[PDB]
Design a protein around this ligand. Sequence first.
Ligand code: MAU
Ligand code: GDP
Ligand code: PHA
Lengths: 99, 83, 208, 378
Amino acid sequence: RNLSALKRHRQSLKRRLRNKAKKSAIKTLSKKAIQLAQEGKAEEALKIMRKAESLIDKAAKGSTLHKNAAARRKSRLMRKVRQLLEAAGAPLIGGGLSA
Amino acid sequence: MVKIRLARFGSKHNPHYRIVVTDARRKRDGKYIEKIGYYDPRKTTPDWLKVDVERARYWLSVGAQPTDTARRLLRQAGVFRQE
Amino acid sequence: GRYIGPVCRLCRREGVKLYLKGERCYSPKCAMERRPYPPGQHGQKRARRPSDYAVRLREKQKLRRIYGISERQFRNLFEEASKKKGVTGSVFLGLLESRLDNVVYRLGFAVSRRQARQLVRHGHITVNGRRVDLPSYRVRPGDEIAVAEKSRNLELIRQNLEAMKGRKVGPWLSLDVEGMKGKFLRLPDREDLALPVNEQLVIEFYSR
Amino acid sequence: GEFIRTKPHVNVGTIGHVDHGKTTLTAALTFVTAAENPAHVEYETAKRHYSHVDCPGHADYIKNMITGAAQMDGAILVVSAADGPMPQTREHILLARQVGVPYIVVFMNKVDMVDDPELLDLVEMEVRDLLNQYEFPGDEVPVIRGSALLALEQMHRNPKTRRGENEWVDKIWELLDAIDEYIPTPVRDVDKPFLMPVEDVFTITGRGTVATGRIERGKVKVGDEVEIVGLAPETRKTVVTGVEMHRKTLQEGIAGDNVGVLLRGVSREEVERGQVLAKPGSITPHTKFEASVYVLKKEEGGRHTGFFSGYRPQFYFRTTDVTGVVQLPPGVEMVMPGDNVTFTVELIKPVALEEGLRFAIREGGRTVGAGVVTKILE
RNA sequence: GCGGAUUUAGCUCAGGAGAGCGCCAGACUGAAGAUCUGGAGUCCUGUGUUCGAUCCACAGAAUUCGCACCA
RNA sequence: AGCCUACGGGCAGGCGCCGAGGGUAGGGCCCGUGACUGGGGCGAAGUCGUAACAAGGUAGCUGUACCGGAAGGUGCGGCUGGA
RNA sequence: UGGAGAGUUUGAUCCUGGCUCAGGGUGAACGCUGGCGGCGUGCCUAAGACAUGCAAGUCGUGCGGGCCGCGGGGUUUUACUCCGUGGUCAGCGGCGGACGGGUGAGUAACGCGUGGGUGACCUACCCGGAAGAGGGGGACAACCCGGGGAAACUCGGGCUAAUCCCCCAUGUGGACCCGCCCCUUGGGGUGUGUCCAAAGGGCUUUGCCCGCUUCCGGAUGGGCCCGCGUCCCAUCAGCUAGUUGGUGGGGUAAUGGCCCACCAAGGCGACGACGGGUAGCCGGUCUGAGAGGAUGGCCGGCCACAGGGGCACUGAGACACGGGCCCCACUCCUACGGGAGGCAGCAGUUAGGAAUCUUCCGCAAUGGGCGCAAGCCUGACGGAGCGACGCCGCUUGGAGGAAGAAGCCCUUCGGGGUGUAAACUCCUGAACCCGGGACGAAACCCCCGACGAGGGGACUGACGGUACCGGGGUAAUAGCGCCGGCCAACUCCGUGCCAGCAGCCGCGGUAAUACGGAGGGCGCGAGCGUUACCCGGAUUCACUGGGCGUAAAGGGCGUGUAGGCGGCCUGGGGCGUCCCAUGUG
Ligand SMILES: C/C=C\C=C\[C@@H]1O[C@](O)([C@H](CC)C(=O)NC/C=C/C=C(\C)[C@@H](OC)[C@@H](C)[C@@H]2O[C@H](/C=C/C=C/C=C(\C)C(=O)c3c(O)ccn(C)c3=O)[C@H](O)[C@@H]2O)[C@H](O)[C@H](O)C1(C)C
Ligand SMILES: Nc1nc2c(ncn2[C@@H]2O[C@H](COP(=O)(O)OP(=O)(O)O)[C@@H](O)[C@H]2O)c(=O)[nH]1
Ligand SMILES: N[C@H](C=O)Cc1ccccc1
């Protein structure tokens, strides 16, 4: 009947459950960030936005995010931050973004 | 990856391969990327083996593991001998 | 294949005496020499003017029957000939003459084309050394066509080449009666051949 | 599952009046022997391997009994001790004689219903006399007394029941012993050209058509070329793709074996009951022949009127029956019962025929003649 | 294989083998037609029952429809 | 409210949009079949009359209109392929 | 280097016009018949349903164990059973399972074809170059313990190894925001800030081999986009809400209403929109003198699908035929408590149909997956089997033999025909018999050199004891269609508008070359006929290459829109047109 290839499935699952996680972190972590820019914060936002970055490029190592998807997430993430702190705040706290 | 191997032709009980370079994936007698020779494992003709080297030379200079027996013939036609 | 059956029955009909048996077809009895009329209950009765088609037909059937070769085989040659560049009319014959069985006849080894076949078939003939039994086989210019060693002593092949001592043969040939081995000089040109046939009709017929 | 030939093979079956116990005995026989060796069944004793056909025995199955009995090396006549011989007991005995069943073993069944020693001896006496009446050696046949039902129920209770443990089961062993000893193992014509009359044809779902029958002579194995002769318009030739014994793969079937022969590329529309499978060129289909025929006397169950030209009775050849037109010699208007004569016949359908082939002549359900093919005309 | 239905003049069809039709022939025609004259089974087979069988009984055959199982 | 933690967070679970199909409703397009009914095609010698071809024995034909067993008749107008 | 026409409307004629025949072709089928072999080829119908067996795995040179069979002592001994190696069963982990094989259902579409675009993109394994791998940590199977089930298989508990997952470091480099210079759709460089790396295993072990990580280039394989080309009906004429565009997002490897808000009202159509029908596309194939007409079976290329429909996950790559989830239909199994399956893979069964095969041998070769390799798998493939289905080669004999057996058919009763045919005589010798016996197979592997270049050694054949060679060696199958004309081939008898024939014309009514038998003849021959379908002839849809006064065909006439077409002369551009070269094909 069965022909041992199920392992792929078995593995499949695991691998899924695996990145599903980290991926969400990126999100929750990202939102958290923007939420502080929208809330017009400063450092904490960047600190987050900063941590954000790292968590992403990290996901790029595995079979999760890759190619430009990598950048895409960032090229936007920090793209908004700046365009949220330009509402007075000013990158007073040296974070990922550079003046 | 890309390979240098033989492709059957001729008739039944009468092989007549064709020294060629194709993507591994394509089928045996599939569509080649470029021919480089022919080989008759029976020498019915005095000219059974034959290989344009410059070409075979190139396809290697760009990476292209040839079948073990693709090496044979190639070699035999003095493809690697450098003096 | 090779017909099989009554022949001096065509040595008739066609009217034109053609040699299918050889030896006898010289006697005072090719039957044509005895019966100048077509076979059958009728045959000898006022015959109607053959239609412009019957002609083109009867000629063909003639020539073909001469070599005793199947329509299929015949036809194929014709076409091939119609294909090869040059005067199709002539050509045809060439290819039609290049048949081993034929050669082996003109080269005297055989008293008649029908007998020729047999010989060629039974391996009694050979070419450029190796032997052949493909009557159909088309001999190229420059080929040596001789009897096989084992055959060299056949009571027949003997009696045959016997008479050959003396007689000359086809300008496009060369028989070495001694070592009984002829050669193929070149493809004969119309003038060289001389059969009771107008190759044109045949051509025509095949455009019916 | 494979079948390995290890003991001499014999074909038997059950005959006897309706309800006397033929089918119950057949089941008992398989269960009883199953304890030792792990409507057509098989079972074996320490001496032989048996193929057993259980005859329903009804009037509408007459043609089936004919072919079934014709392939038996011996028959088991079941007679109920509570009823004694009945019409079918007599009918099956005559048929057995006419188709040549060589030996008869009697099993007086239902003795669990009769204890009176006198009644039991009377029944045996009646059966022996009945057999003598049709020329069977009634005074010599084995007559085993038992109960097929009690033996069967015992095996159902204890499938492992062995000989010597139960009186009823032991009665079945008495029968098995009698069968082993009284019914001789016939000599099989295994050295002659293969020939097997087709009994039935089926399609083994997902495997192809299969033709069953008892090999009359010769042998057959996968890869063998065989001709299907008779009945159809032309003889068909194919290759054997399988040979089975009771649905078990068989190395090679031999004369005497009742097997299933799976055929290549032939549909159940190309092979049928009555045709014969045979070595190519060994037998041919014919319709016209001459034969020496004995017209049965009225005292032998035949008719009191004789045969006449134009008569169209049924001719029974191996596993089928075909209508044939009788033609008597010039001057002869009739062949009377009790006489032996030679006449010509033209069947309405081709049949695999050969000189010396025996056949019976019946008009409806009555046997009126016994003949032998003496010359094939076409 | 098991069962039912079916199987009567050339065509259509019903216990003392019939009706209808047209159908066949003759005469006439140069012919055909039209008109006039005239004429006319084995009842699927066999056997049996009966004074007598298309009809009743048995055996069989063939056609047909449903059922059939699966080395 | 649960589970994990390296306290950021993850999973489970909850809600929503999309959603195969399923239901109900009302349309569109095509095929089959239907009592009867309408004409049409073809089929050796059945009926009725004679429209047309020779002024076809009232020139013929034709659009229209009415009418009559049937061809057809007639009215108006037209054409010659009629005089 | 290429083109032929005939029969049939009439008393006869010319014209028009349809019908018809002669040719070629087919994955054929049906009838009668049927000897040998080679190479090809074989479900066109129900993308209907399927028994059984086999079709995708492979690494111990990534990790730890279970079971089985060898070798060897640390405390003083059995026990915590610590170690090197050779089997087997799974587990973990890696790579393959996206190729290969099957089918044409759907699709009228950027699907296919062709030629370009990508400053809008990806690409595992393979090549080339640059650069590195220092420290800790983590948990899940296997396994052990207890439990439920007929089965399929599953829950609770306790351990553990990594090239498994994770963090910190180092960051040649690479990613992202802003600014500058260069270039121009998001391309190349650069400044600050921020962010991201690694895996060990094996031998001849401070020396290599196989791997790991990062980046740039190459090669191969794709995604997306665009111009032109690609079916019948207009008795389908108007179509459209994500519909057309826009700003901002979301989404992706990336462009884009692909998607979502908000806004603007557009977008397409007689150059045929929309709708119905039908269909996989091409390379080619068939016919034709060609132009065309028809076609898309085998093989090659593209697409599409895996019982019907939807959806994601894993991954370089799939929405994945022999992976997963759900709904539906269907079939099955059962211990009636639940579960199982998906041949449009090979072969085989059933149904349907006019009809389409062996449940074969082998991995020896080629090609593919994994591995350092030995090597394992491979119904891919290589071979064999079945069918005159096709093509080709070949046999049933050869030379003699009568002013001419017999039989049979004609007969003007002399004779004529079959007919050199036969018999008969000589010679050859398919079949069969015995002997020998392959090519396809040189690599991978082993030694020297450096495991390279170059040289030497060794193994391996399914088909097959077959081809083929040599010796012996018997005269050893013929059938089908036709014979009034077209169209080659005629007489007798039977029959009597009956029976029957028949492609069109037609034949048969008592002397039939037309029906049926016969003698004879013509044709083709292991085939010959028939039915079906495509092109031709058909200049019969006519561009080549036709027509409309009476043969079918001028609109009842006019006005005029779109469209089609356009006098003479001079000059500019150069789209059509024409030439050359080059890419492509
Ligand atoms: C019998 C059916 C089919 C047989 C087919 C072929 O038969 C065979 O050809 C077979 C070969 C002989 C055959 O032809 N059998 C064909 C025939 C063969 C006949 C013989 C031998 C015989 O001798 C004259 C012997 C039996 C002989 O008769 C006697 C019988 C007397 C019966 C009287 C019954 C009478 C008044 C009666 O009213 C009656 C009755 O009581 C019971 C049942 N019913 C219905 C009755 O009416 C006695 O028994 C003797 O022994 C072969 O066997 C074939 O292989 C087979 C089997 C293919
Ligand atoms: N009492 C009794 N009944 C029996 C016996 N054998 C059979 N039977 C029964 O009798 C009936 C007929 O049995 P069956 O074998 O079918 O008879 P068949 O017609 O000869 O095959 C069934 O009901 C059986 O159970 C026996 O030995 N004793
Ligand atoms: N051996 C065969 C198959 O089992 C015997 C048989 C035939 C026919 C029917 C049942 C049994």
